[PDB]
Design a binder for this molecule. Structure first.
Ligand SMILES: CC(C)=CCC/C(C)=C/Cc1c(O)c(Cl)c(C)c(C=O)c1O
Ligand SMILES: CC(C)=CCC/C(C)=C/Cc1c(O)c(Cl)c(C)c(C=O)c1O
Ligand SMILES: [Fe+3]
Ligand SMILES: [Fe+3]
Ligand SMILES: [Fe+3]
Ligand SMILES: [Fe+3]
Ligand SMILES: [O-]
Ligand SMILES: [O-]
Lengths: 264, 264
């Protein structure tokens, strides 16, 4: 019931105390829809760099992971749920910057050049949201200390600054950098799943948060393993979309149709 | 058909030449849904400023309209379709900046503070899209000269800069400024409709563009008058949402639920 009578009212500020906090309202209605036993066979891939931009993208991602796994100490001593949930908490904060700077920029360009965008913006904005929902889920499982909260604030100041300037100069580099990020994400989350299937990591967070259960249309019988499965699937999707987008830039197809709009 | 086999492919760049350019792909599937004879009675309103921020917002909007109508010469000599379509072309370029800076910023804040956003971001992003589709429609009707294309590029450089810094400092001012923008938008577009109903402006662009016909689920028998009706309705919706949002900031409800998520 949204009509002229509501459009003509000045404010609905006086309605806020009678509207419920529902978990389905945290995202848009564009929710992934994975079937677990199919997404079980998401695999680990590597796209070959084309030339100098692509080598830059990959070396920067590899340099970043080696720094990150070494400083965060992920490597030595056994995997645990605490360092898994911890790691993801941190990285999912950065994770939703690229897609948002991307869609913001294609949006601004579409507005100033009065051109069509042909389905790109929506894909990058929903991507940004997806990653943000990754964050929302992990923060139901672990609430961070102050050091990690301060690190997250500064890490955003730098990556937003990096990504904004990187995307104005070379959208190709950004999409490719992201493609290569999600390659590592799919590796990490398949590490998580493998350590579970092998009993090396006995997960305890098996009451999947409500936020995630409605976001991924997961049953109440979904476990931690299933949550990591559907997150990893999301990551892989971003892996392809981004490498695809970068490729389109490489071929001067950046003003072409978003192929994923129809593959849908 | 989106599964592990597609998630595991590296790129779909080789599919782009076999995917059609459909007008429905230009937006997301979150389309307004107005009934013409109801939205016919959208009216002209004015929210009273609360205090200094609100007076600033309104005076800046009034100062901007008086400059704009005077320099653009909208005032003297009769209304025409050419100056109507022209005016809107220009203003709809700015029109979709606020909502995008808004959602980008609430998104970034949600990511760095690991907090819930409770349905706000999606509303501002879809708003930004809505205005952008206003732009897409008007550019089917009139293609601008170079002077206006150069003015649009510079006007974005300034408003994006203004709005970004304004929203970091006072989201309340921005939402309120926007509220007051849409007040004028609803006035302009009801001027358009009234000049039509009175024969002062005999519109010729009566083959509503395909982009708009699918975006607003308008029939092939929709005329120019109907297009302006549904644009004006959209504007009024933004008028309320924004004043509502500003009000929530005024009351320190900025971390509360987006009331519109449920009013839906
Ligand atoms: C960009 C930066 C400041 C650090 C990136 C370090 C890196 C490439 C880590 C791999 C990796 C990732 O790049 C991403 Cl995007 C995720 C989600 C995970 C999940 O655990 C992950 O392990
Ligand atoms: C912010 C700026 C550089 C100029 C704004 C001038 C102004 C307040 C014009 C009124 C107005 C508007 O503010 C908006 Cl947002 C629209 C869409 C129309 C439509 O014609 C409109 O007439
Ligand atoms: Fe992620
Ligand atoms: Fe990711
Ligand atoms: Fe508009
Ligand atoms: Fe508007
Ligand atoms: O991620
Ligand atoms: O507008």
């Amino acid at each position: 019931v949204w009509g002229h009578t509501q459009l003509n009212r000045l404010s609905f500020l006086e309605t806020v105390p009678v509207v419920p906090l529902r978990v389905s309202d945290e995202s848009s209605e564009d929710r992934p829809t994975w079937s677990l036993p199919d997404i079980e066979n998401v695999a680990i891939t590597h796209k070959k760099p084309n030339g100098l931009v692509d080598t830059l993208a990959y070396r920067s991602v590899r340099t970043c992971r080696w720094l990150f796994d070494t400083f965060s100490l992920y490597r030595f001593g056994s995997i645990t749920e605490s360092k898994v949930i911890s790691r993801c908490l941190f990285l999912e904060t950065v994770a939703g910057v690229p897609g948002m700077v991307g869609g913001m920029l294609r949006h601004l360009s579409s507005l100033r050049y009065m051109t069509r965008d042909k389905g790109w913006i929506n894909t990058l904005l929903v991507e940004a949201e997806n990653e943000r929902m990754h964050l929302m889920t992990f923060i139901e499982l672990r609430q961070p200390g102050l050091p990690l909260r301060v690190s997250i604030i500064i890490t955003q100041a730098i990556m937003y600054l990096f990504l904004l300037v990187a995307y104005v100069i070379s959208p190709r580099f950004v999409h490719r950098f992201v493609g290569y990020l999600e390659e590592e994400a799919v590796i990490t989350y398949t590490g998580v799943m493998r350590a579970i299937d092998e009993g090396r990591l006995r997960p305890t967070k098996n009451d999947v948060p409500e936020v995630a259960r409605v976001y991924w249309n997961l049953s109440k019988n979904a476990t931690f393993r299933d949550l990591i499965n559907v997150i990893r699937a999301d990551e892989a999707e971003h892996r392809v979309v981004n490498h695809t987008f970068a490729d389109m830039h490489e071929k001067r197809l950046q003003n072409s149709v978003n192929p994923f709009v129809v593959l849908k």
